[PDB]
Design an enzyme around this catalytic site. Sequence first.
Site, PDB file in Angstrom:
ATOM      1  N   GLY A  34       0.814  -1.192   0.000  1.00  0.00           N
ATOM      2  CA  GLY A  34       0.000   0.000   0.000  1.00  0.00           C
ATOM      3  C   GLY A  34       0.854   1.250   0.000  1.00  0.00           C
ATOM      4  O   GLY A  34       2.064   1.214  -0.219  1.00  0.00           O
TER       5      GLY A  34
ATOM      6  N   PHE B  95       3.083   9.132   4.295  1.00  0.00           N
ATOM      7  CA  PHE B  95       4.409   9.096   4.932  1.00  0.00           C
ATOM      8  C   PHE B  95       5.287   8.036   4.255  1.00  0.00           C
ATOM      9  O   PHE B  95       5.943   7.223   4.915  1.00  0.00           O
ATOM     10  CB  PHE B  95       4.253   8.845   6.453  1.00  0.00           C
ATOM     11  CG  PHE B  95       3.128   9.652   7.091  1.00  0.00           C
ATOM     12  CD1 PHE B  95       3.365  10.929   7.617  1.00  0.00           C
ATOM     13  CD2 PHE B  95       1.820   9.146   7.134  1.00  0.00           C
ATOM     14  CE1 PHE B  95       2.318  11.683   8.188  1.00  0.00           C
ATOM     15  CE2 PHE B  95       0.768   9.891   7.699  1.00  0.00           C
ATOM     16  CZ  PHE B  95       1.018  11.160   8.228  1.00  0.00           C
TER      17      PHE B  95
ATOM     18  N   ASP C  33      -2.918   4.563  19.270  1.00  0.00           N
ATOM     19  CA  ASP C  33      -3.795   4.351  18.115  1.00  0.00           C
ATOM     20  C   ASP C  33      -3.930   2.869  17.880  1.00  0.00           C
ATOM     21  O   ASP C  33      -3.508   2.329  16.862  1.00  0.00           O
ATOM     22  CB  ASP C  33      -3.271   5.042  16.855  1.00  0.00           C
ATOM     23  CG  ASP C  33      -4.291   5.079  15.743  1.00  0.00           C
ATOM     24  OD1 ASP C  33      -5.504   5.071  16.019  1.00  0.00           O
ATOM     25  OD2 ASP C  33      -3.964   5.124  14.549  1.00  0.00           O
TER      26      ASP C  33
END
Length: 260
Positions: free
Chosen positions: A20, A24, A132
């Site tokens: 993917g 960043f 996260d």
Amino acid sequence: LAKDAWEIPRESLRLEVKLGQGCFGEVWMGTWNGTTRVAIKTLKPGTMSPEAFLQEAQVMKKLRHEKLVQLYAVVSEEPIYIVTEYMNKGSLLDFLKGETGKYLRLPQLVDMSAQIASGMAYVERMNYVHRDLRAANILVGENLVCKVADFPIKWTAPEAALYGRFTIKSDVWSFGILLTELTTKGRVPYPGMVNREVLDQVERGYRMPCPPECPESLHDLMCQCWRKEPEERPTFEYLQAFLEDYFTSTEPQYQPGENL
Ligand SMILES: CC(C)[C@H](CO)Nc1nc(Nc2cccc(Cl)c2)c2ncn(C(C)C)c2n1
């Protein structure tokens, strides 16, 4: 430019299939030295500095655990390449939401969850904080193995969502949200709610019900993760053990249903 003996020649790497992308830099499957499958994360010279995208090597070096995805070797002088272990079913979210997803039942999802918590309990022991934690940031591999590693208001604890107090207990909150992900096999929490309702309603005391066919001993432990007062939510060490013994101590008379 002085560096560690983690450092490899950038011809040993062999960037093969593009997994993917994102803001960043991108991420690839590939080969390091002769054989060895590898993930290869990279930085785009454009987004963040060398010191920025070489923080998650400051840590990823010190941290070795079975259920944290293991750094294998870096290349520091840009263009950057972080090489790590390959996880070959993609994020927890994809996996659980794709072809195999439908075949998983509760014994399997509970086991995955026990693994995630084993990792978040090593995180715990080291006085680290993830910030996260959700299925999209878990990776899956052969034998239904699941390793932690790498604006989501719906997975984030109130105290963090509003006042920015991230703590390992605010991580536990997301764990519980992540339990809804495993238990409905991929679904966004708080279905058909935008973020302002989620903030609104959790603030007035609302909590996701018990998902379809989800034994009520599971939901209790989601509600334990969703306690208002963060010092009360249970540790990853409690979480882990509970999920390890689920089918003997808690639900030893569980029969497989339509879906779970
Ligand atoms: C580029 C992203 C979309 C994906 C998943 O979030 N990243 C990703 N996929 C990985 N694996 C993977 C395997 C099959 C299909 C896809 Cl899309 C990803 C992976 N293995 C090890 N790592 C990091 C810890 C370096 C990985 N990271």
